[PDB]
Amino acid sequence: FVEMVDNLRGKSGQGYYVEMTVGSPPQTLNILVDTGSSNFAVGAAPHPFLHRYYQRQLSSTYRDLRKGVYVPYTQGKWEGELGTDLVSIPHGPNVTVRANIAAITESDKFFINGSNWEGILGLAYAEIARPDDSLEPFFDSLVKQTHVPNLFSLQLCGAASVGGSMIIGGIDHSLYTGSLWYTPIRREWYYEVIIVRVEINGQDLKMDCKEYNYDKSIVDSGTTNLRLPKKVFEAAVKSIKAASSTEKFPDGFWLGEQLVCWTPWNIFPVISLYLMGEVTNQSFRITILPQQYLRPVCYKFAISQSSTGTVMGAVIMEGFYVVFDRARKRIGFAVSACHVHDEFRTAAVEGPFVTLDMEDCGYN
Numbered sequence: 001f002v003e004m005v006d007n008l009r010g011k012s013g014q015g016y017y018v019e020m021t022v023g024s025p026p027q028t029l030n031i032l033v034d035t036g037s038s039n040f041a042v043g044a045a046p047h048p049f050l051h052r053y054y055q056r057q058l059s060s061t062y063r064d065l066r067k068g069v070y071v072p073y074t075q076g077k078w079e080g081e082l083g084t085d086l087v088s089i090p091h092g093p094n095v096t097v098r099a100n101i102a103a104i105t106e107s108d109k110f111f112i113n114g115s116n117w118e119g120i121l122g123l124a125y126a127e128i129a130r131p132d133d134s135l136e137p138f139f140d141s142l143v144k145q146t147h148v149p150n151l152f153s154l155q156l157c158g159a160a161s162v163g164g165s166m167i168i169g170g171i172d173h174s175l176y177t178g179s180l181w182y183t184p185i186r187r188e189w190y191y192e193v194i195i196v197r198v199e200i201n202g203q204d205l206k207m208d209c210k211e212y213n214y215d216k217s218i219v220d221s222g223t224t225n226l227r228l229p230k231k232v233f234e235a236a237v238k239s240i241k242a243a244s245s246t247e248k249f250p251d252g253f254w255l256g257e258q259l260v261c262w263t264p265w266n267i268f269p270v271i272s273l274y275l276m277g278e279v280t281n282q283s284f285r286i287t288i289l290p291q292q293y294l295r296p297v298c299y300k301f302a303i304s305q306s307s308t309g310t311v312m313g314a315v316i317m318e319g320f321y322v323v324f325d326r327a328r329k330r331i332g333f334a335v336s337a338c339h340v341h342d343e344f345r346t347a348a349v350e351g352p353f354v355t356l357d358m359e360d361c362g363y364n
């Protein structure tokens with residue numbers, strides 16, 4: 001798998017992207033890697049922000065599906081025209097697939113000015129695909145049409161350029177230390193998981209574990225922040241505040257809108273999430289450092305409130321090697337060989353723990 005190591009790039013805050021080709025002859029595009037959506041969508045028109053775009057006129061293997069797609073988001077949108085064509089990943093497996101492609105023809109607040117990517121690879125499941133679940137996502141096509149095992153893994157390394165690896169069809173054991181620990185994919189739409197306990201510096205928040213997963217908890221490479229449900233965020237901050245009241249901060253910094261410049265680190269607590277294990281009454285925990293939730297912009301607060309559920313974004317994923325084990329409906333976490341630490345504390349994955357009533361923690 002050494003051909004796929006270090007195949008991810010990006011700039012701080014503008015997502016991680018992989019190089020892909022579409023059409024024949026191949027057109028090279030940089031494509032955002034997103035485990036929190038399910039469409040393969042690329043710019044197909046000369047939008048000012050774009051370095052390049054999909055030119056369908058130039059592709060002999062392109063087929064029109066004669067159907068449109070409109071994708072609104074909380075802020076802005078994209079829309080396009082559905083079709084299929086041949087796709088490959090230069091620093092991925094040595095295969096070629098016919099996949100669905102949304103050719104983006106109109107967008108609003110989608111593309112980023114100054115970014116170096118031109119599309120998005122939705123790696124989540126068909127149920128959240130637009131317009132509906134009959135548009136087969138790229139990874140489903142890849143597995144169906146080739147002998148690539150139904151599994152991928154992400155080492156997101158962070159920092160200004162960022163780097164990483166998407167190991168398609170397997171695991172590279174050199175990218176983590178210790179052991180992988182697995183949590184069940186609760187249902188195949190998002191990569192939904194169940195959090196069963198939260199600790200701020202060893203201290204249980206003592207909330208009903210249901211609140212951690214209201215109305216869901218997901219693993220999302222397209223989100224920067226650790227995102228927590230409203231009630232949980234307030235409890236969490238009230239706790240991080242108290243744990244680090246040796247220094248003073250405006251109430252807007254936790255919302256979170258100011259810097260701080262030099263580094264102590266040690267006034268801030270570690271954050272531990274306990275995830276449902278593979279075995280009845282068994283859990284494990286993942287622990288992140290302030291290095292993960294204090295993002296340079298001098299730093300900013302990268303935990304924020306949400307009404308979509310818990311979102312385990314880059315803040316979480318940058319501490320760990322993450323295995324999206326689709327074949328066994330599970331997600332693996334191990335300590336990342338590249339995560340940003342100091343000489344006191346490191347990110348951790350630890351188990352097993354005894355946790356009762358873990359099935360009560362999921363929202364219905």
Ligand SMILES: Cc1ccccc1-c1ccc2nc(N)c(C[C@@H](C)C(=O)N[C@@H]3CCOC(C)(C)C3)cc2c1
Pocket residue numbers: 034035036037038071072073075076077078108109110120128220222223308311
């Ligand atoms: C930023 C944007 C602008 C216009 C249209 C779509 C988007 C967009 C694209 C990909 C996204 N990928 C993501 N992982 C996220 C965050 C996650 C938690 C999320 O809300 N995912 C939804 C999955 C279904 O499709 C949605 C509604 C566009 C995002 C938001 C996204 C928003």
